[PDB]
Design a protein around this ligand. Sequence first.
Ligand SMILES: *[C@H](O)[C@H](C[C@@H]1CCNC1=O)NC(=O)[C@@H]1CCCN1C(=O)[C@@H](NC(=O)OC(C)(C)C)[C@@H](C)OC(C)(C)C
Ligand SMILES: *[C@H](O)[C@H](C[C@@H]1CCNC1=O)NC(=O)[C@@H]1CCCN1C(=O)[C@@H](NC(=O)OC(C)(C)C)[C@@H](C)OC(C)(C)C
Ligand SMILES: [Cl-]
Ligand SMILES: [Cl-]
Ligand code: NA
Ligand code: NA
Ligand code: NA
Lengths: 306, 301
Amino acid sequence: SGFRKMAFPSGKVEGCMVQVTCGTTTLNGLWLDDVVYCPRHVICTSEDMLNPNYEDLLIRKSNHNFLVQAGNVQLRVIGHSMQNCVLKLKVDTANPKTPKYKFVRIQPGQTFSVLACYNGSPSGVYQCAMRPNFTIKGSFLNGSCGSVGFNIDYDCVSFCYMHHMELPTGVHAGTDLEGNFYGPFVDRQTAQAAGTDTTITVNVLAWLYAAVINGDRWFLNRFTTTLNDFNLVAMKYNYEPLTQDHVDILGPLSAQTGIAVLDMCASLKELLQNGMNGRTILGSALLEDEFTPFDVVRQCSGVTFQ
Amino acid sequence: SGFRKMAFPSGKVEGCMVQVTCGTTTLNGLWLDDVVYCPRHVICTSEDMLNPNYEDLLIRKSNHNFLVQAGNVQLRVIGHSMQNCVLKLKVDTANPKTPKYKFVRIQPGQTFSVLACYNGSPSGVYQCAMRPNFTIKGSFLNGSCGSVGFNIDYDCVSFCYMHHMELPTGVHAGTDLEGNFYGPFVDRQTAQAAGTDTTITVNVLAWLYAAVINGDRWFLNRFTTTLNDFNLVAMKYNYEPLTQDHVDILGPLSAQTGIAVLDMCASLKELLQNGMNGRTILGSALLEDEFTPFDVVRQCS
Ligand SMILES: *[C@H](O)[C@H](C[C@@H]1CCNC1=O)NC(=O)[C@@H]1CCCN1C(=O)[C@@H](NC(=O)OC(C)(C)C)[C@@H](C)OC(C)(C)C
Ligand SMILES: *[C@H](O)[C@H](C[C@@H]1CCNC1=O)NC(=O)[C@@H]1CCCN1C(=O)[C@@H](NC(=O)OC(C)(C)C)[C@@H](C)OC(C)(C)C
Ligand SMILES: [Cl-]
Ligand SMILES: [Cl-]
Ligand code: NA
Ligand code: NA
Ligand code: NA
């Protein structure tokens, strides 16, 4: 038993991280097959960032302007191109440690692991969620750009995030590996801000199920509700709507614990309307929303990766 | 900016995890060079566990009674020895993925990453602390034994924990990699309650410094305290004593933020007296005690 904020094992991703330097900027790249992916803003000076014309800035660069290092070994860049907000540097050597992988775009509410890197060297791993406002609450310093987020299924790494920037409130924004930003953010030095965020209702419910599985039951009650009535409460408390698909996804946890989703929703309604009365749930005094239903099932059943 | 429970990248440890089976029991082993380390209780039946004589049980085992599997490859056991509560299985193949490593026994309050594994394969990685009562608050199921805890400061893996058991209160107990248990626990099915746990004061102070570094000041105050008055108060909340060693180790964070250590202690005293009044610190509504001073410097700088 026990329940922790748990990341995927990061080894398959560690073997893909390299250092990319253009001019005076160093950041990280992802080396898969014979291509290194990194943020396109690596090519910009500070002045360029004010109003960058990335296609003109890139024609001005040559292969030799990009220094790529895998550990102590230099990788020769033999071509370059842009895909949306990501730069693809073709190198002369395919990464012999390339795992089975795919590029996926995730939806708000979905979680993933971040391998925070500096100078091409993995430094730490932690678990995040794509917030409803399309930011992530990361932990990133200067030089972290190009660090990636991922999930694993069996033996396949699904890369879903590449890090590009920090916003004024201290949260983070980035792209999928096809270079499309999550959220209405752009890679230029102009005013931008995180929108008002909301709480990921289906994830809170999943974590309440994790709590019950781990013996924490004090918030259970005799009451149930309807999807329509609970969604009025959710809106009042800046919680995301709960859909029938969310209810269906939580079916396994309901059957296992004997607490129907709408029964658990009546628990969550009372917690929102009345608070915790000084108690905790799974060692938290807040309602945790960065575990998905699948995260709960995975951790509580001991799923492993090959 | 930001502040997360951050584990070390797990790849160097993933490359060391194997499956060990003896009789009907399967757990994980750690394969370093030509040795596989695992909990010695792998050799016990359910009956053996009340009062097992491990020396007597082990002398009866042949090398072929141990099935060791590294991915899809069976490793051949060629000898075995017992060191305290760890079994060392000598195998005929050395692990080509052995990282630079050392074994370190840690003190209460120290943190480490856990790579939770089942059947020799990794499930996930999370951060833990050695509690003052020598338990860890893990996430471990049947078959997780032999999973290890570690740090990887400066490219060398320091192995500090191997998992052996869950206690009735839902926390976890295990050994260093020399097989010595942390705390009063034993690998026997006899009663062995953990002491009342306490909060790791030096770590709470480190986390308050992290909050200041990340831009929050709401909990600061104009007061200070003597060290002894702070300890007299903090102990009434089941906080651990703060020693002069702890004050010294907080010096760099104090210098970076301009908040004297004893002034931060006055902040913590007020937080214990008042609560947060609907506010949060680094996304928590509780005082967090599983980040060390070293961890804060690692992550914020
Ligand atoms: C790439 O390594 C780096 C990662 C950043 C540095 C600090 N923490 C991180 O996550 N990315 C950048 O430095 C990018 C390049 C353009 C500027 N930038 C930022 O992250 C800015 N953000 C910024 O200027 O935001 C707007 C004002 C454009 C909305 C950071 C460094 O500035 C603030 C003031 C810290 C937010
Ligand atoms: C090894 O894989 C396994 C890991 C355990 C299983 C459940 N969670 C874990 O962390 N270790 C064990 O099963 C060991 C072997 C002897 C029994 N044991 C336990 O962990 C017992 N603990 C136990 O008997 O504790 C005492 C009563 C002796 C203090 C667990 C499985 O039993 C309880 C009832 C869950 C505590
Ligand atoms: Cl909390
Ligand atoms: Cl220590
Ligand atoms: Na109910
Ligand atoms: Na016996
Ligand atoms: Na030791």
